[PDB]
């Protein structure tokens, strides 16, 4: 168990940006700018800084050239400058390695703390950031597939209850989860900003970054991304979807960048800001929990995820999940799922749905 | 074995107009088509339900007829003039097909009508006269989040596509898109009268069988809603394939299964084909974007399962086996192949379907 | 000027519901349930309790039969039970009339405080509420015009800065406003929940309630409401829109219920939850500030609003605005607006945009 | 009355393109290409050739530099090369001036006939055209406001019945019209391709060109054009809309190019291809006939339209309408409109709907 510090938790506003190490900057730029339409906040020969349509902070995504593609930092904005001090004291009490840079790690961020958190993830906490032109009414720039906000992150970690309790202590509230009757937890979603998630835990070998998610305004914007990828003859980089999620109720798509970093496109989840927001638990065998339409979840979605770095920039060693595998219990040889609980019609045994 | 072109002039066909489907439980079928899908009842009794789409003014687009064996009974096309029903009768007689003409129609809301057993074993109807009903196109008080606005097309399973294609072209259908390979095989063709990608289409397989009937929505989110509704009704297992973007036709689509496994496509936003030199588009059968533009795999049931069709006595037509190569086998079977980019091994699939 | 209490402000989560007095319950039910598709939580011969598609608290709207159509209460949910005590102490320090009921004023609300606030508005603060089936995935019920959330209120008050200062002390943060070059404020929007607004102030004679706003998922859902109103041959109850707002950037529509209570339908504003969220100030003469496409603002939008009640159920006396009128300075016979600041081309003098004058 | 020729009518497929004369080619290019996103088939110092997303013929719009902005030709594609001969013979029998160019009037069109038609309009008929890359799946190019098709033209002409008969003889079928109870026709819509219209007649002084219409896939695409015009601070070039039409049931928008040529953006009308398609007749006083939501029709919509040229390139003289004016009888001083037939409630006397009067 990760104990609760006596030091007060930092007041976390939201997920704010991710720094991804990429191997070929120009190829990554083509994907995130030319295909996906993110907006350039700064670039040079080593980094590209990108933001979504409605953002006013400096960036939502930093692409950093490096030898090994990996998550370098998942950053959360905190409410006040003093909250960076709180974060430092909190993680120090947890016994975690921390690094404070009063002038930031990346451009357009000021005083910032990076930590190797108890689950092995590189978290950053910052308040100070350079404001930029908020493009929310720049419809002269608006793409048919426009990405409008950074929505969340999703982390692969072996022991979901352990991570959950740690995030709850940090002030994240669980909105949805997936469990079975035997008591295993397979996934949880948790928030600060009053949407279904800011970060999420997916049971698996970790620490690995499952995905970063961006929002669109409407469902047709997501469709357009798929349509554009077909036109560019990169439909093989569409991993899963588009679909309606069970968990979150959002319309979604998963796609793969040039280093196989997974990006979710997402819209139209619901408000979770009330403190007694009802928590929704789905059964792992419910074939509408992930895709509400019952489309099968391809195995790669369960098994593949990005490396993460420590504060020296080396790859974090991975810890194998010992709890039951969601893949194995649903679509593996001894797995099953149902459409209607208790009905063998519309159930799937030892394979996935739809055929 | 080639179907000759008649001396007799072809009838001037306007469009696909309605299908008569035999169903086994009229109440279960009513629940699907009316309560789930929202089609509008023009007339019903204890034996039949007459249904129309939101923008239709002719009596119906779908007749559900209770019967012992679920099947297609008639696929009907409307012709331009009452004289065109005469033309149709002379045309099919010269083809040596069985015909039956009724001056007062075979179903309610249709007048003088010709039914035929066509050269591919399908029950075609041709009619002009039909009872006009209230066009509900501005009845936004009734409009469903999933509203089906038009009948768009039919799709027929037949073993020899080129043979069927020539016959439909002589009848005045123009081919808009097709799927072929590098070895002389045709796997599918789409052909039209009304200036959309199709009014009917041919899918290579054992036949005659009816592959599907397609209805249009206004917008893509209407199709998404049908999927969402089916999830809420906990009948997502009746979603067969999709939603997706087609390669062929460029339409947004969904395939669902009614209670007798009759396949319904929901469809929107294909393109205009009414110019007589409309460019024909041919896809290679191994192109993994040809059916679903996003490269999502086509489930085997889509290729193997289709509805029975009846002859004019109401008996099931015998199924003739396809001997040409199978689209399923050559793309997703154990010796199958598909590509994302022609000539690129990366994003290609050997002996398996796309996406894992 | 309204002083800042020493007592701490209650921690307000969001707007939560309004209680509207309506004169004919059956006609109001037809509007809100049959036309708009809101979901019934409870009803009887006296009241109808309604919620939006994604709501889990008991209701977003209470329709209460009474003799005089009016706003009876604008209710905000607070973070904890103890925040209701805080609300009570805060408004007592302000010298406002308060009434506390441990078992609520309306069904499905528990311990609740109502106040006649400094601007004359009946505010409620509550934490306790009866949870109901959250209908967010009930696509078997989902209509083509589905109202998915309660988004905000908008209040007519004569002195906007006075009201704004008071709301800021309550914890609301201003997101956008409308001003002129000579220091007059015409409107302000302010939030708790991290959207553009939870309540807003429109300059005018008050206290009156300008509107209550509900969200849709998508723009087409708003279009459908218009389409449906056309099919029902009640297009005369479409007051204004549909449009794209300047302020808020939301897609919008304003419609009128059977007692002329104004309802806004709204979608796709932006996130405001960061504490240094950039405020946006528009010039009153900017013809894209209200409708981004430049469509004229109908004069009834500026002049008409609902009565509000005091805690005895009597109508609050109206105080006249003395600051300049937005209607007069933009679309009246001495008014003007521009498309491009400083450009005579695309400017309008003594009339509204698009070729119309006031009727 | 225009007689029906003995000579057979050409078989017309559809509206195909317009040639518009523009005064400043770079300005016009900025509008059609940079604002609206049309695709360039060809250009030089004198002309720009543009097509929609789904087109395979060479172009849907030709912009031709000249001294006087005007419609130079409205072009219809015919079914066969032999139909161009039929057109020549048909119009010659009608007593009309004709000009035949075996290699076309504009690039990418072959054998073509231009005519000064009986209503004074420059019509072109052609079959031969250079095919180009059909961009219908080029989602790498697809704009958020993408114009996917050319849909129709709309002509202003003083005597609608006279024009309607002539177009019916040419094979167009009337889908909808607007009349009153005193024998006046104010407008008619008529088709060949199986949509509500390929061309239409609007009562007024003429010949003038009312608009050219392009379609989008979905309603949000039209919304985006408005939004973009707001961002470019050219909302003054949005004339009317967006709305839902009564006539056609389409979602619509009217905008004005740099020479005040009016462009409609349009989506989701219905299928008219059956020969007994029911003809819908709206009453001119029905306030849902033009905008289904009851929004008022701006006076410029009724009064302003583009000049048209003769075959010499000179402007056609305008003949005044003597039949009653739709503007006058609906929104003018002695005008009337209703929301519900026979109901005074929701009716408008001597002014426009929604609280406006003529400027
Ligand atoms: Ca009259
Ligand atoms: Cl999922
Ligand atoms: Cl397909
Ligand atoms: Cl406004
Ligand atoms: Cl109109
Ligand atoms: Fe996610
Ligand atoms: Fe189909
Ligand atoms: Fe509002
Ligand atoms: Fe038009």
d(CA D295, CA D286): 12
| Beta-ladder partners of A187 | A178, A202
CB C36 within 8 A of CB C145: yes
> What is the chain B residue with the closest CA to A341?
B234
CB D217 within 8 A of CB D268: no
CA of B52 to the centre of ligand 5 (A): 28
- Asked if the C-beta of B293 comes within 8 angstroms of chain A's C-beta atoms, the answer is yes
Question: Is the backbone of residue B56 left (phi > 0), alpha (psi -120 to 50) or beta?
Answer: beta
Ion ligand 9, residues whose Cβ is below 5 A away? D 154, 213, 264
Burial A129-153 (b: 16+ CB within 10 A, else e): beebebbbbbbeebbbbbbbbbbbb
> What is the chain A residue with the closest CA to D36?
A140
- Asked if the C-beta of A137 comes within 8 angstroms of chain C's C-beta atoms, the answer is yes
d(CA A147, CA A154): 18
Cα–Cα separations (whole angstroms), residue B157 to B333, C180, D217, D302: 19, 70, 31, 54
What three-state secondary structure class fits B160?
coil
d(CA A267, CA A52): 14
CA of D239 to the centre of ligand 9 (A): 13
What three-state secondary structure class fits A301?
helix
CA of D299 to the centre of ligand 1 (A): 21
Residue D344, Cβ density class (10 Å: 0-12 exposed, 13-18 middle, ≥19 buried): exposed
Among residues A142, A105, A144, A145, the alpha carbon closest in space to that of A123 is found at: A105
| Beta-ladder partners of B155 | B212
Neighbouring CB atoms inside 10 A of D300's CB total 18
Q: What CATH number should be reported for the domain whose range is A288-355? A: 4.10.1270.10
In angstroms, the separation between the Cα of residue D291 and the nearest Cα of chain C is 9
C220 → closest Cβ in D219, D345, D357: D219
d(CA A58, CA A12): 18
CB B114 within 8 A of CB B126: yes
Question: Is the backbone of residue A226 left (phi > 0), alpha (psi -120 to 50) or beta?
Answer: alpha
Cα–Cα separations (whole angstroms), residue D333 to C89, D297, D327: 60, 15, 10
Strands (E), A66-206: 70-78, 98-101, 112-116, 122-126, 149-157, 173-179, 185-191, 199-203
d(CA C159, CA D329): 44
| Beta-ladder partners of D336 | D349
d(CA A132, CA C227): 40
d(CA B79, CA B81): 6
CB D155 within 8 A of CB D306: no
Task: Say which CATH architecture domain D288-359 belongs to.
Answer: Irregular (4.10)
C13 → closest Cβ in A54, A270, A274: A274
d(CA B157, CA B170): 19
On whether B345 is known to bind a ligand per the annotation, the reply is no
- Asked if the C-beta of D82 comes within 8 angstroms of chain B's C-beta atoms, the answer is no
Q: How many CA atoms lie within 13 A of A123 on its CB side?
A: 29
CB C214 within 8 A of CB C264: yes
Among residues D216, D194, D338, D340, the alpha carbon closest in space to that of D268 is found at: D216
d(CA D121, CA D118): 7
What does DSSP say about strands D173-179 and D280-283: parallel, antiparallel, or unpaired?
A: parallel
CB A37 within 8 A of CB D142: no
- Asked if the C-beta of A332 comes within 8 angstroms of chain B's C-beta atoms, the answer is no
What three-state secondary structure class fits B353?
coil
Residue C232, Cβ density class (10 Å: 0-12 exposed, 13-18 middle, ≥19 buried): middle
Identify the chains in contact with A, defined as 3+ C-beta pairs within 8 A.
B, C, D
Angle at D338 between CA D335 and CA D344, to 5 degrees: 100
Binding site members of D for Fe(2+): 152, 211, 264
| Beta-ladder partners of A75 | A17, A124
Angle at B259 between CA B258 and CA B262, to 5 degrees: 45
- Indicate the DSSP class of residue B106: S
Cross-chain residue pair C275–A79, CB shorter than 8 Å? yes
Burial C138-149 (b: 16+ CB within 10 A, else e): bbeebbbbbbbb
- Which ligand sits nearest to residue B212's alpha carbon? 7
Neighbouring CB atoms inside 10 A of B321's CB total 8
Question: Is the backbone of residue C132 left (phi > 0), alpha (psi -120 to 50) or beta?
Answer: beta
Ion ligand 2, residues whose Cβ is below 5 A away? A 290
> What is the chain D residue with the closest CA to A138?
D231
SS (H, E, C) chain C: CCCCCCCCCCCEEEEEEEEEEECCHHHHHHHHHHHCCCEEEEECCCEEEEECCCCCCCCCEEEEECCCCEEEEEEEEECCHHHHHHHHHHHHHHCCCEEEECCCCCCCECCEEEEECCCCCEEEEECCECCCCCCCCCCCCCCCCCCCEEEEEEEEECCHHHHHHHHHHCCCEEEEEEECCCCCEEEEEEECCCCCCCEEEEECCECEEEEEEEECCCHHHHHHHHHHHHHCCCHHHEEEEEEECCCCCCEEEEEECCCCCEEEEEECCCCCCCCCCCCEEEECCECCCCCCCCCCCCHHHHHCCECEECCCCCECCCECCCCCCHHHHHCCCCCEEECCCCCCCCCEECCCHHHEEEC
Neighbouring CB atoms inside 10 A of A312's CB total 8
Binding site members of A for Ca(2+): 181-182
CB C157 within 8 A of CB C210: no
Cα–Cα separations (whole angstroms), residue D338 to B127, D297, D342, D343: 41, 14, 8, 7
d(CA A324, CA B337): 35
What does DSSP say about strands C122-126 and C70-78: parallel, antiparallel, or unpaired?
A: parallel
Token representation of residue B286: 């191994």
Task: Say which CATH architecture domain B150-288 belongs to.
Answer: Roll (3.10)
In angstroms, the separation between the Cα of residue D168 and the nearest Cα of chain C is 31
Domain D149-287 has CATH 3.10.180.10: yes
Q: How many CA atoms lie within 13 A of A312 on its CB side?
A: 4
- Asked if the C-beta of C219 comes within 8 angstroms of chain D's C-beta atoms, the answer is yes
B194 → closest Cβ in D54, D79, D194: D194
CB A40 within 8 A of CB A53: no
Token representation of residue B243: 């939603």
CA of D175 to the centre of ligand 9 (A): 13
B299 → closest Cβ in A233, A246, A355: A355
Q: How far is CA C147 from the centre of its chain?
A: 15
Burial B9-38 (b: 16+ CB within 10 A, else e): ebbbbbbbbbbbbbbeebeebbebbbebbb
Q: Which are the contacts of D218, defined by CB distance < 8 A and separation ≥ 6?
A: A220, B218, B219, B220, B269, C220, D267
- Indicate the DSSP class of residue A315: B
Cross-chain residue pair A294–B239, CB shorter than 8 Å? yes
CA of C213 to the centre of ligand 8 (A): 6
Cα–Cα separations (whole angstroms), residue D229 to A144, A212, B336, C288, C351: 16, 33, 51, 11, 22
> What is the chain B residue with the closest CA to A244?
B228
Q: How far is CA B119 from the centre of its chain?
A: 18
d(CA C18, CA B355): 50
| CA-CA-CA-CA torsion sign (C247, D230, C275, A275) | positive
- Asked if the C-beta of A294 comes within 8 angstroms of chain B's C-beta atoms, the answer is yes
Angle at D221 between CA D216 and CA D225, to 5 degrees: 105
CB A202 within 8 A of CB A181: no
Identify the chains in contact with B, defined as 3+ C-beta pairs within 8 A.
A, C, D
A13 → closest Cβ in C80, C131, C273: C273
Cross-chain residue pair B143–C220, CB shorter than 8 Å? no
DSSP codes, B20-85: EEEES-HHHHHIIIIIIT-PEEEEE-SSEEEEE-TT--SS-SEEEEE-SS-EEEEEEEEESSHHHH
Angle at B135 between CA B132 and CA B139, to 5 degrees: 155
- Asked if the C-beta of A275 comes within 8 angstroms of chain C's C-beta atoms, the answer is yes
Q: Which are the contacts of D62, defined by CB distance < 8 A and separation ≥ 6?
A: D17, D18, D19, D20, D47, D48, D49, D50, D106
Q: How far is CA D169 from the centre of its chain?
A: 20
Neighbouring CB atoms inside 10 A of D170's CB total 23
What three-state secondary structure class fits B313?
coil
Among residues D286, B225, B139, the alpha carbon closest in space to that of C229 is found at: B139
CATH topology identical between C149-287 and C288-359? no
In angstroms, the separation between the Cα of residue C24 and the nearest Cα of chain B is 22
Among residues B186, B185, B190, B157, the alpha carbon closest in space to that of B175 is found at: B190
Contact residues on chain D for A36, CB-CB shorter than 8 A = none
Token representation of residue A283: 């059964």
What three-state secondary structure class fits A213?
strand
d(CA A287, CA A337): 5
Q: Which residue has the tokens 């929310």?
A: A136
d(CA D221, CA D143): 9
Token representation of residue C54: 């994604």
Neighbouring CB atoms inside 10 A of B339's CB total 21
> What is the chain D residue with the closest CA to A141?
D228
In angstroms, the separation between the Cα of residue A231 and the nearest Cα of chain D is 6
**Residues A23, A26, A27, A29, Cα dihedral to 10°:** 110
Best mutation target, D356, D357, D358, to test chain C (most C CBs within 10 A): D356
Cross-chain residue pair D224–A137, CB shorter than 8 Å? no
Token representation of residue A66: 């490096």
CB C346 within 8 A of CB C336: no
d(CA B44, CA A176): 45
Binding site members of D for Mn(2+): 152, 211, 264
> What is the chain D residue with the closest CA to A230?
D139
Question: Is the backbone of residue A37 left (phi > 0), alpha (psi -120 to 50) or beta?
Answer: left
d(CA D322, CA A227): 53
Ion ligand 3, residues whose Cβ is below 5 A away? B 291
d(CA C56, CA C135): 8
CB D187 within 8 A of CB D178: yes
Contact residues on chain C for B229, CB-CB shorter than 8 A = 139-140, 142
Q: How far is CA B34 from the centre of its chain?
A: 20
d(CA C126, CA D9): 76
Q: Which residue has the tokens 């701006």?
A: D298
d(CA B78, CA B125): 8
| Beta-ladder partners of C313 | none
Q: What CATH number should be reported for the domain whose range is B289-356? A: 4.10.1270.10
SS (H, E, C) chain D: CCCCCCCCCCCEEEEEEEEEEECCHHHHHHHHHHHCCCEEEEECCCEEEEECCCCCCCCCEEEEECCCCEEEEEEEEECCHHHHHHHHHHHHHCCCCEEEECCCCCCCECCEEEEECCCCCEEEEECCECCCCCCCCCCCCCCCCCCCEEEEEEEEECCHHHHHHHHHHCCCEEEEEEECCCCCEEEEEEECCCCCCCEEEEECCECEEEEEEEECCCHHHHHHHHHHHHHCCCHHHEEEEEEECCCCCCEEEEEECCCCCEEEEEECCCCCCCCCCCCEEEECCECCCCCCCCCCCCHHHHHCCEEEECCCCCECCCECCCCCCHHHHHHCCCCEEECCCCCCCCCEECCCCCCEEEC
| Beta-ladder partners of B40 | B52
What three-state secondary structure class fits A88?
helix
CA of C103 to the centre of ligand 2 (A): 41
| Beta-ladder partners of A47 | A64
CB C209 within 8 A of CB C61: no
Q: Which residue has the tokens 């912009």?
A: D63
Q: How was this structure determined?
A: X-ray
Q: Which are the contacts of A319, defined by CB distance < 8 A and separation ≥ 6?
A: A120, A158, A205, A206, A207
**Domain B11-149, CATH class in plain words:** alpha beta
Token representation of residue C210: 């300008």
DSSP codes, B225-273: HHHHHHHHTT-GGGEEEEEEE-STT--EEEEEE-TT--EEEEEE-----
In angstroms, the separation between the Cα of residue D9 and the nearest Cα of chain A is 42
Token representation of residue B136: 């509900």
CA of B289 to the centre of ligand 3 (A): 9
Cross-chain residue pair D228–A140, CB shorter than 8 Å? yes
Task: For residue B170, report the phi and psi dihedrals to the nearest 5 degrees.
Answer: -60, -30
Task: For residue C119, report the phi and psi dihedrals to the nearest 5 degrees.
Answer: -95, 5
CB D288 within 8 A of CB D294: yes
What three-state secondary structure class fits B320?
strand
Neighbouring CB atoms inside 10 A of A67's CB total 8
Residue C102, Cβ density class (10 Å: 0-12 exposed, 13-18 middle, ≥19 buried): exposed
d(CA B299, CA D229): 45
Give the domain ranges of chain D: 10-148, 149-287, 288-359
In angstroms, the separation between the Cα of residue D332 and the nearest Cα of chain C is 12
What does chain D come to in residues? 359
Residue D340, Cβ density class (10 Å: 0-12 exposed, 13-18 middle, ≥19 buried): middle
Q: Which residue has the tokens 């708790």?
A: C192
The fold of the A10-148 domain, in CATH, is: 2,3-Dihydroxybiphenyl 1,2-Dioxygenase; domain 1 (3.10.180)
Among residues D297, D298, D282, D296, the alpha carbon closest in space to that of D341 is found at: D282
Residue B73, Cβ density class (10 Å: 0-12 exposed, 13-18 middle, ≥19 buried): buried
Q: How far is CA A285 from the centre of its chain?
A: 23
């Amino acid at each position: 168990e990760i104990p609760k510090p006596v030091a007060p938790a930092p007041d976390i506003l939201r997920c704010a940006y991710a720094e991804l190490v990429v191997t070929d900057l120009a190829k990554s730029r083509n994907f995130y700018v030319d295909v996906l339409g993110l907006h350039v906040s700064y670039e040079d020969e080593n980094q590209i800084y990108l933001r979504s349509f409605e953002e006013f902070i400096h960036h939502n995504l930093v692409l950093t050239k490096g030898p090994v593609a990996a998550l370098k930092a998942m950053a959360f904005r905190v409410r006040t400058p003093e909250d960076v001090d709180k974060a430092e004291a909190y993680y120090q009490e947890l016994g975690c390695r921390t690094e404070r840079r009063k002038d930031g790690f990346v451009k357009g961020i000021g005083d910032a703390l990076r930590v190797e958190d108890p689950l092995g993830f590189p978290y950053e906490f910052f308040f100070e950031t350079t404001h930029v032109e908020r493009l929310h009414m720049r419809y002269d720039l608006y793409s048919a597939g426009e990405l409008v906000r950074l929505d969340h992150f999703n982390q692969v970690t072996p022991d979901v209850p352990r991570g959950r309790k740690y995030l709850e202590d940090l002030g994240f509230r669980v909105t949805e989860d997936i469990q079975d009757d035997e008591g295993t937890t397979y996934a949880a979603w948790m928030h600060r900003k009053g949407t279904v998630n800011d970060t999420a835990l997916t049971g698996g070998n970790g620490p690995r970054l499952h995905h970063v998610a961006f929002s669109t305004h409407e469902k047709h914007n997501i469709i357009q991304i798929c349509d554009k990828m077909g036109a560019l003859r990169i439909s093989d980089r569409i991993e899963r979807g588009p679909g309606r999620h069970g968990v979150s109720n959002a319309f979604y798509l998963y796609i793969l960048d040039p280093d196989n970093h997974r990006i979710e496109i997402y819209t139209q989840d619901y408000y979770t800001g009330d403190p007694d927001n009802p928590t929704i638990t789905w059964n792992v065998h419910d074939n509408q929990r992930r895709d509400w339409w019952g489309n099968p979840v391809v195995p790669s979605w369960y098994t593949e995820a990005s490396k993460v770095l420590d504060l020296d920039g080396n790859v974090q060693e991975i810890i194998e999940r010992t709890d039951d595998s969601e893949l194995e219990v649903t679509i593996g040889a001894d797995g099953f799922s149902f459409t209607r609980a208790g009905d063998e019609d519309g159930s799937y045994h030892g394979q996935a749905s739809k055929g």
